Write a protein that binds this ligand. Structure first.
Ligand SMILES: [Mg+2]
Ligand SMILES: [Mg+2]
Lengths: 257, 257
């Protein structure tokens, strides 16, 4: 019996394609002369934002570039400084990226009718979430609970946030819960937490497409990209893979057999 | 691979037989004119002390007698009042009941050598533990971390305290941990948290015997009582059972196969 579902935020319940942090990540590196790609920027998507900045400076390609510019490798000074700008730019546009993804709200309402608790974990800090959650609520979305990396010792891939969701929701064991996310770090979080782990494709950070791009893309090109994402989720721990949230119910019935 | 081991306190690491509260639970009920057996007083051993008093008032036999004497069932005020007396008494004698059980420390140090983190959960309040922990530490025992029901939404059998341990000790998943306890509620906490659950027999609250009573007892009767406890532990979800702590290391090695 699945008594609760723990949802990721960006790229899962709000912000189709997880675009809010994409250009911000590229913007902060572009200034130093180190231009990164959208694919690199998306690699550590899901982790706490500051950990994300560090992970980017850790990447060989980005590190080689940077060192070859400033004549040295990125120091904690360079990370703190970039994350600093990351916040200033993120906070201004943040209200525009809290729109509930197409059919998520009906799924949420369906889960509540059955008495299933609604939890959530995030990559955003508490300060950022006060903005995202308020705005999402205005648009018709509010989970039963929400935990950010600021509430526990560390964010994803650690299972700390999921354990806190269970605690405040009163649901145990962990296998009576489902984690649904859209990034590789979301899958690692669900598994390290010992819960049933589900990956969503359309609207995910891993796909990195806007709704329009999905609606207007050549069917064959789309399916190729969909399977690339499905395989990535699977290789990284996913018990299940769904194209949209509309299949969540089916994964639940399957698990309960 | 087992990364950490969570031990219960009274009855597992310290206070052989778990006598510290025994006579107190009996005292607070006899005063009201409702005599309770030692078996009844020990049945819910492990739960937060206040929850323990409430559990006793919920037991059919105890509830029935109270209804006979007072013409009503126990009131929250009654429980609140009994618990106040439970503290006044328990506090004055706590220090005497905080001494490590014979060979536990040996197993403890042998685990620290194998790079194993030691965590702990209790039924005692934060206030009570200050006393127990200070004294236990004076006699050679001090785990890496300790959690009480005061740190989480509820105590045993809920797995909250164990998740906290996992967070602070930085270990995951839960099955990379072993829960070592001596009560039924200790077994349910281990299973509810999704970890390897092990019951200690000699010196456990379930046995109820002291060291002298154990040694100065017939060899047929003892093995009879040990089997009663062993079956109880197992019947309640325990994966494995050990008579003394010197068998823990074997269970570990066994599991890592
Ligand atoms: Mg996400
Ligand atoms: Mg105990």
């Amino acid at each position: 019996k699945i008594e609760a579902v723990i949802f990721a935020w960006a790229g899962t319940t709000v912000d189709y394609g997880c675009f809010a942090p994409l250009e911000v990540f590229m913007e902060i590196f572009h200034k130093r002369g180190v231009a990164i790609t959208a694919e690199e920027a998306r690699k550590p998507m899901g982790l706490l934002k500051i950990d994300h900045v560090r992970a980017l400076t850790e990447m060989p390609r980005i590190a080689s570039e940077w060192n070859r510019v400033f004549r040295q490798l990125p120091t904690e000074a360079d990370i703190q400084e970039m994350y600093e700008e990351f916040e200033e730019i993120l906070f201004a546009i943040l209200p525009r990226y809290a729109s509930p993804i197409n059919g998520v709200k009906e799924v949420i309402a369906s889960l509540r009718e059955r008495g299933i608790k609604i939890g959530s974990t995030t990559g955003y800090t508490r300060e950022m979430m006060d903005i995202v959650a308020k705005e999402a609520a205005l648009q018709g979305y509010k989970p039963d609970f929400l935990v950010t990396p600021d509430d526990v010792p560390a964010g994803r891939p650690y299972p700390w946030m999921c354990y806190k969701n269970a605690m405040e929701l009163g649901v145990y064991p962990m296998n009576h819960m489902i984690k649904v996310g859209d990034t590789v770090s979301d899958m690692k979080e669900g598994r390290n937490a010992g819960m049933w782990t589900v990956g969503v494709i359309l609207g995910s950070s891993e796909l990195g497409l806007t709704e329009e791009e999905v609606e207007n893309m050549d069917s064959v090109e789309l399916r190729e990209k969909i399977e690339v994402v499905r395989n990535r989720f699977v290789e990284n721990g996913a018990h299940f893979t769904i194209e949209t949230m509309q299949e969540l119910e089916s994964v639940m019935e399957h698990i309960e057999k």
